[PDB]
Amino acid sequence: AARGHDLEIEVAVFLEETLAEQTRTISYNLPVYNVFGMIESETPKTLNVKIPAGVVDGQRIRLKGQGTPGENGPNGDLWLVIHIAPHPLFDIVGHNLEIVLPLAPWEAALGAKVTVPTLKESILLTVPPGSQAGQRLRIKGKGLVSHTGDLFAVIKIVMPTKPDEKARELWQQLAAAEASFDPRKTW
Amino acid sequence: AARGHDLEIEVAVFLEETLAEQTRTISYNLPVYNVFGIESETPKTLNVKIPAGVVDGQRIRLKGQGTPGGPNGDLWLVIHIAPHPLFDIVGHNLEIVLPLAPWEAALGAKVTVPTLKESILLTVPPGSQAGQRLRIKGKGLVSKTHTGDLFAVIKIVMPTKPDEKARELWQQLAAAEASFDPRKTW
């Protein structure tokens, strides 16, 4: 008389439902064997499991005896391992969230106040003058919740498409203005 | 009625070296355990032609070339192409961050770009974009029968705080391109 084996089901969970006390329907099969010992059938099972809120990524939950049938012995256990889903805007890094902050070059140079999204509502982040590409601007009070974490606005500089006659001239003049700038001092 | 012991030998290569077959001379040490189971180290040297296209971690085995009452052990050559400070490998291809000033992307330029071998002058067309991939054919890795390319991936970079002049032109710019919405995606 030996016990059954443990099953594992990786449950993907949209980050947004992190603080959501959520219900997932789990479905799995338990194999049924021949007198000659091979599978010949699978019995289908389902449970409506109440997943607690604020389940951290990769965290584990145990449903005892929901695993494989024991031999002769107790059933094995079933494990639901969480895997927080890849957010469209935010990105889980540590206990904090990251948001890429697209900025037009003028916006980065002059500075600008622009609305940025959070978990729920949208705050107003201010960008200092002269900010650089890769700039890691922090916004406290908006981040993973449980205490609560912080969001980081990581600046990325974007460009409009090819410019028309007038916008061109201007660019040539900045080019002239900033002719001394070496964007590749590293090489 | 015993048998042999094995050996792992790290063999450091450089990304540039990988571009062609290279004859190499590895010096190592062959252990000596007393007929117990260590107090000596009879060294050796082998001359091997490493092939064009190897990859970090790759292993080449040499038979019998380990310790020696029956069959001898085996020798393991573990390649170790430690990380290059400019080119990131992506299969048979290479990637390089190409810093550009906002006005280089806007106006379009010609920029000298490095290579595993020798530099090349790259044409950045007017209107280029953050994250854009400019292809440099054949400057990627040389696998057995294929040769990858190198991609210069644009990254707009800005200078430090500006001044009356710069700042005045940036304001004009903003007006000229007032319709542009970087955060369209929000």
Side-chain angles (χ1 to χ4, degrees), chain A residues 1-17 20-49 51-137 139 141-165 167-184 186-187, chain B residues 1-2 4-136 138-143 145-160 162-164 166-167 169-170 172-186:
Chain A
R3 192 178 79 105
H5 312 291
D6 291 3
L7 276 166
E8 301 200 8
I9 290 175
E10 12 281 318
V11 174
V13 177
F14 298 131
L15 171 54
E16 293 158 298
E17 298 178 302
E21 198 290 52
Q22 44 172 146
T23 282
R24 190 68 58 90
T25 269
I26 309 294
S27 296
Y28 59 104
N29 295 330
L30 284 186
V32 175
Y33 298 87
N34 274 158
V35 84
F36 314 117
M38 335 203 204
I39 310 185
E40 70 160 4
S41 148
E42 291 204 320
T43 91
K45 292 220 155 193
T46 39
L47 295 174
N48 284 120
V49 184
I51 299 180
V55 300
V56 67
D57 181 68
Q59 87 100 121
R60 285 167 144 261
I61 305 178
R62 164 168 152 277
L63 310 176
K64 205 180 187 181
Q66 301 305 326
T68 284
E71 209 65 31
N72 296 152
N75 281 53
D77 293 333
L78 176 69
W79 292 88
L80 306 178
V81 315
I82 305 309
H83 298 289
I84 297 289
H87 202 275
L89 295 179
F90 310 110
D91 180 321
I92 306 173
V93 171
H95 211 296
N96 281 355
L97 296 177
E98 294 190 4
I99 191 72
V100 169
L101 172 39
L103 294 193
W106 45 94
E107 298 184 336
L110 308 164
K113 304 192 299 298
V114 284
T115 49
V116 173
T118 83
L119 290 170
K120 291 188 177 181
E121 34 48 27
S122 308
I123 81 303
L124 185 69
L125 186 68
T126 69
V127 180
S131 299
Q132 292 291 351
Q135 194 82 335
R136 190 153 159 79
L137 285 166
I139 314 180
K142 306 296 176 183
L144 286 60
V145 170
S146 55
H147 73 277
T148 300
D150 294 4
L151 184 57
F152 279 103
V154 298
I155 293 186
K156 164 175 168 173
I157 299 181
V158 297
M159 300 287 301
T161 58
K162 186 186 187 308
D164 60 1
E165 184 179 20
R168 194 185 305 152
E169 255 281 13
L170 285 170
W171 284 117
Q172 310 187 13
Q173 305 199 26
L174 295 73
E178 297 292 46
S180 63
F181 175 54
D182 190 346
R184 293 171 286 275
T186 46
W187 307 340
Chain B
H5 300 73
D6 281 16
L7 293 182
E8 176 175 324
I9 298 299
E10 181 186 348
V11 176
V13 168
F14 292 101
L15 196 61
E16 322 83 60
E17 294 182 345
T18 292
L19 292 180
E21 183 175 34
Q22 95 198 77
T23 294
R24 211 66 137 68
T25 297
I26 295 77
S27 294
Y28 63 99
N29 292 310
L30 193 57
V32 158
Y33 302 94
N34 37 13
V35 179
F36 283 48
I38 298 185
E39 43 67 40
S40 171
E41 277 196 319
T42 64
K44 291 199 168 190
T45 31
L46 71 156
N47 184 110
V48 268
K49 287 208 295 169
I50 293 180
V54 305
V55 163
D56 180 293
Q58 183 167 351
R59 287 177 179 255
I60 317 78
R61 169 177 164 267
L62 298 194
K63 200 169 190 174
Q65 280 295 326
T67 279
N72 322 61
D74 278 350
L75 183 70
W76 287 106
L77 289 182
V78 308
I79 273 51
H80 169 259
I81 305 184
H84 188 110
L86 297 174
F87 304 105
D88 296 323
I89 308 73
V90 169
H92 307 278
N93 291 314
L94 270 27
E95 284 180 15
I96 192 167
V97 164
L98 173 55
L100 298 202
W103 44 82
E104 282 173 316
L107 296 170
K110 282 183 174 176
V111 176
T112 286
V113 169
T115 286
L116 282 192
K117 302 285 281 304
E118 79 294 311
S119 295
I120 77 305
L121 189 47
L122 178 73
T123 307
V124 173
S128 294
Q129 299 299 334
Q132 182 173 334
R133 286 161 57 86
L134 291 165
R135 182 194 175 193
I136 293 176
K139 305 294 180 183
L141 303 186
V142 170
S143 63
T145 62
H146 181 256
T147 292
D149 317 322
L150 168 50
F151 292 96
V153 180
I154 301 188
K155 164 175 162 68
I156 307 311
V157 299
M158 300 281 293
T160 53
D163 61 22
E164 291 186 7
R167 169 153 42 91
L169 297 164
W170 285 114
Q172 302 188 61
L173 264 173
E177 289 285 20
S179 67
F180 174 66
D181 179 0
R183 299 163 297 274
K184 192 72 174 178
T185 58
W186 301 339

